[PDB]
Design a protein around this ligand. Structure first.
Ligand SMILES: Nc1ncnc2c1ncn2[C@@H]1O[C@H](COP(=O)(O)OP(=O)(O)OP(O)(O)=S)[C@@H](O)[C@H]1O
Ligand SMILES: Nc1ncnc2c1ncn2[C@@H]1O[C@H](COP(=O)(O)OP(=O)(O)OP(O)(O)=S)[C@@H](O)[C@H]1O
Ligand SMILES: [Mg+2]
Ligand SMILES: [Mg+2]
Lengths: 406, 364, 131
């Protein structure tokens, strides 16, 4: 009952939100085999290696390394001799901070010293330890690439064994390095691509939402497995999966969609429904621009229609406040006695609000020399977007609609 | 309390689950100005009694201030000073180990996040993936008016769950305005007040705060006729002109002699092309010298070039009526621009007994 | 000599698994991976690349705004019968492509007025997309 639902909620939330390790690996057999073999070579012997892993973000780059480490560290007492250092390109933006982190993680600050002294020969002269480098591309943007060069040098040196592992999303990581480090860099690359078809994606979806064999209740788990198996071949679920697979093959989006779908699982509905997945897919695939336009007022809509007319008459040219005001006045004067008698300041405030919402952006920004008036503005919307948004407007008056059509 | 806000609250409560449960690393909430983002989330956090730290981006205009305020408030919930983001991560890991903070999710509410993209390059990506780095059951919320499309960094980062707060309608606005009725009169009286106010001003002013402010300001005049002695027609007839006068201002809430001539000459120099200048001033057929010549032509009396006229010029420059264009060091070829509205210049010319329209080349 | 030694080591590694070993080492540690990355791309990304190529052929310029590219993509989707794509989906695909340095763009602030430049030669794209 309720306790089982709470436990399965916890397990699935841990699986998706935190990305807890799982024994299931998809289409990464050769890559993981190669990486684990090389890690075993670097650990059981004094040989050194340098490898880069290139892939799109969210493609489980970190999972390979984590699984390999959990697989190979516990083999023997080698874990006692092996030391691990982790460096992230986001936290360490300067070489001084990187050196401080390296010293602190190695617990040599007592040996090296506590003060801010720039000398690092204490470690360099003293320098098996493995290095992990997340966001390797950021390190290449340093002033002289000193840390990367020193790491490659000690890797190529014959003093101590050092294994270097880098992670990258850019495919051009080779050209961001200088000639010296590139020559000293062992050209070992692993590529992580989602090289699998739509049926394999469906199998991945079916397996991911499958309860593990360690759950206490067994008949409930079997019923859950049968339910997910049945939901696998439903054509609405397959349509949603086809849409998301066409959009992107990254597993992170799939995990997010599954989490959002599972959010709507309650006691009254212990097992999911295809309509729930349809609702989640609809919630994940709505455009913000149309919503923002829908949330506007009448005066803003009139101003936007005038802006569209200006863009149509003058093909791809900027504009200012005065022309828009003049043609809005023309529109309200052609009509006999419509209730739109507004003065300059209120229209000016409406224009300021529109610019604040960042639907309009200035060109070659300057202030003081040019006022808000007489400033070259441009629109950041498309005609079809305006038409579609105006169709769904709740209480659009007839006059403004016909003016928009004209 | 919250009115017409039940879907989003239910969604958030379902998302949170239990205290020991985990949640998303990043939720990005966006909506309009008067959607009530601050009210709803703060009331929900107070009701659920969760450990949350509320932060304004504008107040913390520097990274050190932001981190120190976050750490101090979190410690008070359970002096600390940090300087770098890595040090902040380490100190956060150290401080989160409290028993009250052991198996509970920590929430960091940030509002007015539009400025975060102008603070540092890597600060936003670091905040997005905080739960991975800390690994300590941490959730970060965002409140903003700009869509997520413009918050995306070039390198791409962990995509937050996007959420939208629905826009308000006539019924919702009327209900919200009619909830806080004054106790000294009937509820239906205030409901009719809100109805007529909406019928007058909903075309332009949809802001809940602004409309409520207008209602608060105008209610005393609404209640006068009954005090003077449920007459709908009487009240409407007595009250209409005041409402029209109020609607005249929805969002709004004597120069020396020679200064007027200087201003009109500057306006003429700015808005009249040079080629026509003689056509308007030479008896027979912008730089400072042009202004001086135009001033000498306009004024019927011979004006001596006393230093006081230059003092007037500089004073007008200071008063932000004339804008200096060229370099400040170059005070032999200075350039000026006039920023006065045309109605103002027409009024001052009328007070001077001068017809500027006869000289404006564009109008002719 | 360094890369020669690396090739010899990799050939020994492969032989552990002839001239074929050395050929595999040299063409794996020197050749570029752009073609296979393009080949393993998604269908929508392929349509986007085809739209970019068509717009470039129509114009002849190496820089194109995001609006014309979007229009060509919509036309190609209509020709292919694919469902109508939203602007947000196209921008997300563009950002994903730009993340791996296949294109060149600054989408942080500009959205509809983004200059797009190909990071690889056009003939390589043609040879990758013909298959
Ligand atoms: N081959 C795979 N087998 C199993 N799970 C996978 C595989 N590829 C990706 N995943 C899952 O995809 C999810 C998202 O991967 P992430 O770990 O967020 O990406 P990443 O490895 O951190 O790469 P970055 O660039 O550091 S964000 C995780 O839950 C992984 O378990
Ligand atoms: N749904 C609502 N129910 C009840 N009162 C509301 C509601 N929405 C807004 N209010 C009231 O309106 C006041 C002003 O709204 P805000 O909370 O300032 O709107 P906001 O979305 O937070 O915009 P910002 O971020 O402050 S510019 C709040 O303090 C509430 O008293
Ligand atoms: Mg990672
Ligand atoms: Mg607020």
């Amino acid at each position: 009952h309720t306790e089982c639902l709470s436990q399965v909620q916890r397990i699935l939330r841990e699986r998706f939100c935190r990305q807890s390790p799982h024994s299931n690996l998809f289409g990464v057999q050769v890559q993981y085999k190669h990486l684990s073999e090389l890690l075993k070579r670097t650990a059981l012997h004094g040989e050194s290696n340098s490898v880069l892993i290139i892939g799109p973000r969210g493609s489980g780059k970190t999972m390979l390394i984590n699984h390999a480490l959990k697989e190979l560290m516990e083999i023997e007492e080698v874990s006692e001799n092996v030391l691990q250092v982790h460096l992230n390109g986001l936290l360490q933006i300067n070489d001084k901070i990187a050196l401080k982190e390296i010293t602190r993680q190695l617990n040599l600050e007592n040996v090296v010293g506590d003060k801010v002294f720039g000398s690092f020969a204490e470690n360099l002269s003293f320098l098996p330890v493995i290095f992990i480098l997340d966001e390797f591309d950021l390190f290449a943007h340093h002033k002289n690439q000193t840390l990367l060069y020193n790491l490659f040098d000690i890797s190529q040196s014959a003093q101590t064994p050092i294994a270097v592992i880098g992670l990258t999303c850019r495919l051009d990581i080779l050209e961001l390095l200088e000639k010296r480090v590139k020559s000293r860099f062992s050209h070992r690359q692993i590529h992580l691509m989602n090289s699998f078809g739509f049926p394999q994606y469906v199998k991945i979806f079916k397996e991911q939402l499958s309860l593990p064999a360690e759950f206490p209740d067994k008949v409930f788990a079997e019923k859950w497995n049968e339910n997910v198996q049945y939901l696998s071949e439903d054509r609405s679920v397959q349509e949603v999966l086809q849409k998301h697979f066409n959009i992107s093959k990254n597993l992170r989006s799939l995990h997010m969609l599954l989490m959002l779908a599972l959010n709507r699982v309650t006691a009254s509905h212990p097992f999911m429904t295809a309509v729930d997945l349809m609702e989640a897919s609809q919630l994940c695939s709505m455009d913000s621009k149309a919503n923002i336009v829908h949330g506007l007022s009448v005066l803003e809509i009139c101003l936007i229609i005038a802006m569209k007319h200006l863009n149509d008459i003058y093909e791809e040219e900027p504009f200012n406040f005065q022309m828009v005001y003049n043609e809005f006045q023309k529109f309200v004067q052609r009509k006999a006695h419509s209730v739109y008698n507004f003065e300059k300041p209120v229209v000016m405030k409406a224009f300021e609000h529109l610019q604040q919402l960042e639907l309009i952006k200035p060109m070659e920004r300057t202030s003081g020399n040019s006022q808000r008036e007489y400033q070259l503005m441009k629109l950041l919307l498309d005609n079809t977007q305006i038409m579609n948004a105006l169709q769904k407007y709740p209480n659009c008056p007839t006059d403004v609609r016909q003016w928009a059509t004209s | 309390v919250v009115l017409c806000r039940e879907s989003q609250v239910s969604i958030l409560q379902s998302l949170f689950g239990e205290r020991h449960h985990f949640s998303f690393p990043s939720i990005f909430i966006y909506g309009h100005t008067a959607s009530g983002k601050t009210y709803v989330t703060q009331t929900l956090l107070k009701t659920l009694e969760l450990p949350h730290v509320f932060v304004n981006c504008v107040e913390c205009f520097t990274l050190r201030l932001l981190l120190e305020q976050i750490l101090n408030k979190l410690n008070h919930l359970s002096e600390i000073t940090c300087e770098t983001f890595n040090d902040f991560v380490r100190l956060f890991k150290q401080v989160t180990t409290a028993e009250n903070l052991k198996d509970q999710t920590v929430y960091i509410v940030l509002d007015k996040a539009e400025y975060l993209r102008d603070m540092e390059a890597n600060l936003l990506p670091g905040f997005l993936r905080l739960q991975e780095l800390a690994d300590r059951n941490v959730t970060v919320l965002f409140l903003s008016e700009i869509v997520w499309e413009k918050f995306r960094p070039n390198t791409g980062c962990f995509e937050p769950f996007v959420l939208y707060f629905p826009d308000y309608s006539i019924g919702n606005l009327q209900k919200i305005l009619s909830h806080d009725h004054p106790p000294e009169y009937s509820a239906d009286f205030y409901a009719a007040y809100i109805n007529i106010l909406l019928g007058v001003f909903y075309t332009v002013c949809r802001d809940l705060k602004e409309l409520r402010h207008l209602a608060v300001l105008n209610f005393p005049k609404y209640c006068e006729p009954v005090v003077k002695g449920r007459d709908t027609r009487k009240l409407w007839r007595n009250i209409e002109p005041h409402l029209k006068k109020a609607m005249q201002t929805v969002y709004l809430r004597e120069l020396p002699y020679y200064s007027k001539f200087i201003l009109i000459a500057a306006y003429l120099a700015s808005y009249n092309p040079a080629r026509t200048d003689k056509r308007f001033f030479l008896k027979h057929h912008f730089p400072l010298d042009r202004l001086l010549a135009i001033l000498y032509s306009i004024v019927d009396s011979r004006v001596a070039p006393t230093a006081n006229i230059f003092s007037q010029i500089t004073s007008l420059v200071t008063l932000q009526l004339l804008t200096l264009v060229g370099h400040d060091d170059q005070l032999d070829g200075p350039k000026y621009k006039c920023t006065v509205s045309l109605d103002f210049i027409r009024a001052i010319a009328r007070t001077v007994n001068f017809d500027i329209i006869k000289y404006l080349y564009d109008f002719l | 000599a360094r890369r020669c030694l690396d090739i010899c080591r990799r050939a020994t590694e492969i032989c552990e698994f002839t001239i074929a070993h050395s050929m595999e080492a040299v063409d794996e540690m020197f050749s570029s991976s752009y073609i296979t990355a393009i080949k393993n791309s998604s269908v929508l990304e392929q349509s986007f690349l085809r739209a970019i190529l068509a717009e470039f052929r129509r114009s002849g310029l190496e820089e194109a705004t995001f609006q014309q590219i979007y229009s060509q993509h919509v036309a190609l989707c209509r020709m292919e019968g694919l469902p109508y794509p939203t602007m947000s989906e196209t921008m997300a695909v563009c950002s994903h492509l730009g993340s791996c340095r296949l294109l060149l763009v600054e989408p942080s602030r500009n959205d509809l007025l983004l200059r797009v430049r190909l990071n690889v030669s056009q003939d390589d794209v043609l040879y990758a997309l013909k298959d």
